[PDB]
Amino acid sequence: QMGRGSEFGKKRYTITLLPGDGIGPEVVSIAKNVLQQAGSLEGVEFNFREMPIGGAALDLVGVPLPEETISAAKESDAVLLGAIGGYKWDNNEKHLRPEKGLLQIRAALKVFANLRPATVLPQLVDASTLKREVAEGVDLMVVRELTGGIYFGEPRGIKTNENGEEVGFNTEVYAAHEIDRIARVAFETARKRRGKLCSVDKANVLEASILWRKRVTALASEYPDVELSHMYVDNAAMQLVRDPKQFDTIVTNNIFGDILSDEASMITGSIGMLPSASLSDSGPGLFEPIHGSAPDIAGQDKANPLATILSAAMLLKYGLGEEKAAKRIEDAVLVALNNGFRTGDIYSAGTKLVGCKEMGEEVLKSVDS
Amino acid sequence: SEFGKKRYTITLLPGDGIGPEVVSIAKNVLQQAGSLEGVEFNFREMPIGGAALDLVGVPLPEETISAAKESDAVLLGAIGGYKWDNNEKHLRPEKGLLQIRAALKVFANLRPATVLPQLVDASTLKREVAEGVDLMVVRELTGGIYFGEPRGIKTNENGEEVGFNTEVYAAHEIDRIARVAFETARKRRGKLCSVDKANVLEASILWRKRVTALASEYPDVELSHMYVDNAAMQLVRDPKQFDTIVTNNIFGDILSDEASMITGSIGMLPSASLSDSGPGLFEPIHGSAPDIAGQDKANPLATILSAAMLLKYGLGEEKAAKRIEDAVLVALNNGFRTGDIYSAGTKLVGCKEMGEEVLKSVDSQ
Numbered sequence: 001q002m003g004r005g006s007e008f009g010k011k012r013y014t015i016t017l018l019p020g021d022g023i024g025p026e027v028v029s030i031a032k033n034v035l036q037q038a039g040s041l042e043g044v045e046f047n048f049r050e051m052p053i054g055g056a057a058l059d060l061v062g063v064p065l066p067e068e069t070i071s072a073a074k075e076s077d078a079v080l081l082g083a084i085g086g087y088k089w090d091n092n093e094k095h096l097r098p099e100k101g102l103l104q105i106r107a108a109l110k111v112f113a114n115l116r117p118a119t120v121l122p123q124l125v126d127a128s129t130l131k132r133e134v135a136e137g138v139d140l141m142v143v144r145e146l147t148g149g150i151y152f153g154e155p156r157g158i159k160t161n162e163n164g165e166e167v168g169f170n171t172e173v174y175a176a177h178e179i180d181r182i183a184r185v186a187f188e189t190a191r192k193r194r195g196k197l198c199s200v201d202k203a204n205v206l207e208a209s210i211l212w213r214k215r216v217t218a219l220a221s222e223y224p225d226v227e228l229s230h231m232y233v234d235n236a237a238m239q240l241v242r243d244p245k246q247f248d249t250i251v252t253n254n255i256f257g258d259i260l261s262d263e264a265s266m267i268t269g270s271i272g273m274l275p276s277a278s279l280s281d282s283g284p285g286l287f288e289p290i291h292g293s294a295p296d297i298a299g300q301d302k303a304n305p306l307a308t309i310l311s312a313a314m315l316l317k318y319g320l321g322e323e324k325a326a327k328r329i330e331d332a333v334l335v336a337l338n339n340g341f342r343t344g345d346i347y348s349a350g351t352k353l354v355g356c357k358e359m360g361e362e363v364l365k366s367v368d369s
Numbered sequence: 370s371e372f373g374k375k376r377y378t379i380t381l382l383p384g385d386g387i388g389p390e391v392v393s394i395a396k397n398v399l400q401q402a403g404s405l406e407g408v409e410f411n412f413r414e415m416p417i418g419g420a421a422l423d424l425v426g427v428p429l430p431e432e433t434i435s436a437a438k439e440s441d442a443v444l445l446g447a448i449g450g451y452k453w454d455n456n457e458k459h460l461r462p463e464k465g466l467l468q469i470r471a472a473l474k475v476f477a478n479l480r481p482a483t484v485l486p487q488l489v490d491a492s493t494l495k496r497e498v499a500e501g502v503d504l505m506v507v508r509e510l511t512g513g514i515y516f517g518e519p520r521g522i523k524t525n526e527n528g529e530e531v532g533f534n535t536e537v538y539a540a541h542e543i544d545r546i547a548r549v550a551f552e553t554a555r556k557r558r559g560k561l562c563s564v565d566k567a568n569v570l571e572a573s574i575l576w577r578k579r580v581t582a583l584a585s586e587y588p589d590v591e592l593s594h595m596y597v598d599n600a601a602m603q604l605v606r607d608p609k610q611f612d613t614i615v616t617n618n619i620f621g622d623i624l625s626d627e628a629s630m631i632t633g634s635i636g637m638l639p640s641a642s643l644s645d646s647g648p649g650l651f652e653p654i655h656g657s658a659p660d661i662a663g664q665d666k667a668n669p670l671a672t673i674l675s676a677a678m679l680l681k682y683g684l685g686e687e688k689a690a691k692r693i694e695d696a697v698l699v700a701l702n703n704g705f706r707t708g709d710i711y712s713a714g715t716k717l718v719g720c721k722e723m724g725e726e727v728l729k730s731v732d733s734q
């Protein structure tokens with residue numbers, strides 16, 4: 001009669017926080033607070049656990065992703081990551097660079113489905129370098145295959161041939177089952193939006209893309225409410241500039257996903273607003289802002305926390321099925337922007353320039369009202 | 370005099386869609402510009418792409434490769450069409466394009482992306498961002514994942530299909546494209562940005578390593594490195610920051626097309642593919658546009674400018690190349706626009722009429 005579960009009708013989730021490097025800890029600290037407050041309003045409690053990753057892990061135990069961090073992440077209900085990278089580690093051997101830890105945690109958590117929404121918010125339309133009429137109303141979702149393809153393909157390496165010359169190689173490889181699963185996510189995703197899915201590949205050159213297109217095509221019959229189309233990656237790169245409003249959902253591989261989602265991100269004009277979700281089958285998902293560790297403003301209360309806050313909303317929605325709590329966060333971010341609040345990266349003439357903590361305070365204020 | 374005329378052999382590969390229309394115009398413009406410099410051409414038309422598939426059942430006939438290799442330069446129209454997209458992999462039009470690039474060993478692909486002042490409004494980027502864009506992509510054209518082995522679709526023991534390709538570069542392949550790009554930047558504004566994914570891929574670690582080692586051979590050139598995903602963003606945010614970019618086959622394909630659309634006018638952009646020895650390959654970057662094939666709507670200016678790159682880079686005919694460039698400029702300054710570049714207050718014309726306007730500007734001089 002109090003509700004499901006064993007704590008007075010409340011739901012308690014275990015969250016692993018991976019603040020990381022640069023501005024990561026600052027923005028995660030704020031999102032944590034917004035998460036707690038919005039959750040509390042829906043009868044949701046959290047056990048948080050901070051663990052090291054990236055440069056922080058390197059300075060601590062000499063690897064970018066400690067076994068103990070993986071264990072903690074795997075035993076959790078969801079993972080919220082801050083940011084990865086710094087100048088200090090830039091002359092390290094490549095297994096000892098912060099980015100390595102990020103690739104390793106994706107693989108370890110088997111979060112093959114990366115969701116990256118790119119929307120132009122009406123309050124920030126003028127931040128885009130695209131003309132207003134082209135940028136306004138952009139609202140697309142890139143579904144990127146995150147744990148396969150060339151990023152993780154074998155064989156790979158740099159070797160010296162018999163002529164004494166170096167040869168570097170990587171393998172773009174996909175098994176049918178890897179394509180099917182990311183395709184299914186994208187079809188389900190498009191179904192819940194405008195019902196349009198664009199599969200992006202290089203099928204006029206690459207056998208790996210021919211298989212991609214074959215499997216995606218064969219799945220279309222299981223989603224008759226979804227209009228499937230296909231586009232070559234180079235044409236997709238042009239169409240994002242020419243008419244980004246044409247897209248609802250895009251599905252593509254690891255490397256094309258990396259390039260196109262980042263292109264779509266910059267087209268919106270405000271990188272500091274953009275969240276992302278990485279989902280697995282049945283295990284904890286990984287949620288993180290798409291921006292970097294921005295080391296040059298670290299510790300200066302300058303960072304935009306909104307992308308991480310919105311990643312926490314994605315954590316609630318996609319990771320935990322806690323939709324009302326997610327909506328409370330999304331609403332509060334909107335109220336802050338409507339009230340004229342802007343951190344430095346989204347500042348325009350006549351708005352209220354605020355620091356990181358102060359922006360969090362405004363979101364918090366709105367959640368609690 | 371007849372004895373002292375300069376003569377070149379040009380192989381024409383009209384290809385598919387609007388390819389034949391635009392190449393026919395560029396051929397005429399080429400003849401007229403050259404003749405004013407005492408240069409005459411022997412043209413031979415050969416099949417490639419869908420056109421070769423329809424004639425002999427392969428996208429690149431042996432006879433075409435022979436003709437191209439024996440010539441001084443190759444001018445190509447366009448490849449591809451819906452007619453052949455349901456073809457087996459070995460028999461799609463595009464395979465012919467990859468095959469001719471490989472056969473001619475044209476590893477150095479030059480794709481200049483500029484915003485013309487007459488056409489600044491055609492970009493979807495704000496005027497202040499698009500105006501003054503002027504970059505060159507130097508793309509490695511005959512190596513990398515496009516040609517790497519092993520490759521295929523196989524069925525494993527379980528009956529499950531696995532599709533795979535190999536991104537592979539030997540150091541000397543990187544060295545050679547890099548040298549071309551350094552030399553390119555030196556002739557431009559002295560800035561080179563090398564683009565890779567060296568934070569993930571071994572092949573790109575070698576890429577960055579070789580380009581870095583070569584920097585000291587061109588100490589007058591300013592070299593920087595950028596990840597391909599960052600480059601895709603920087604082209605949107607501040608494309609004016611770039612002079613010359615060098616990158617591999619697949620990143621070059623993506624980034625150059627992104628840069629092209631950023632300028633706003635795909636129908637204006639030429640390209641050159643150059644080899645160490647032998648004829649170069651010159652073609653517009655637009656596609657076959659099969660919906661307007663035979664409708665006299667095509668913009669011939671990109672192929673006309675590709676013929677200018679042919680003269681300039683392939684044949685060293687600098688004065689003839691300038692005559693063509695000058696004439697395209699005259700035609701645009703006279704207000705002529707094909708449909709793809711039309712704006713209110715201009716003269717909307719078809720393909721043939723645009724060509725004739727460029728032709729009479731050439732012959733004016």
Ligand SMILES: CC(C)[C@H](C(=O)O)[C@@H](O)C(=O)O
Nearest residue numbers: 099102103258262568569598
């Ligand atoms: C840092 C890099 C390894 C990473 C990637 O390529 O996935 C980043 O670019 C991203 O998009 O999250």
Ligand SMILES: CC(C)[C@H](C(=O)O)[C@@H](O)C(=O)O
Nearest residue numbers: 204205234463466467622654
């Ligand atoms: C294969 C073919 C479609 C070609 C390529 O990918 O190189 C085209 O995109 C280009 O840029 O010339």
Ligand SMILES: [Mg+2]
Nearest residue numbers: 258259262598
């Ligand atoms: Mg990226």
Ligand SMILES: [Mg+2]
Nearest residue numbers: 234622623626
């Ligand atoms: Mg292309």
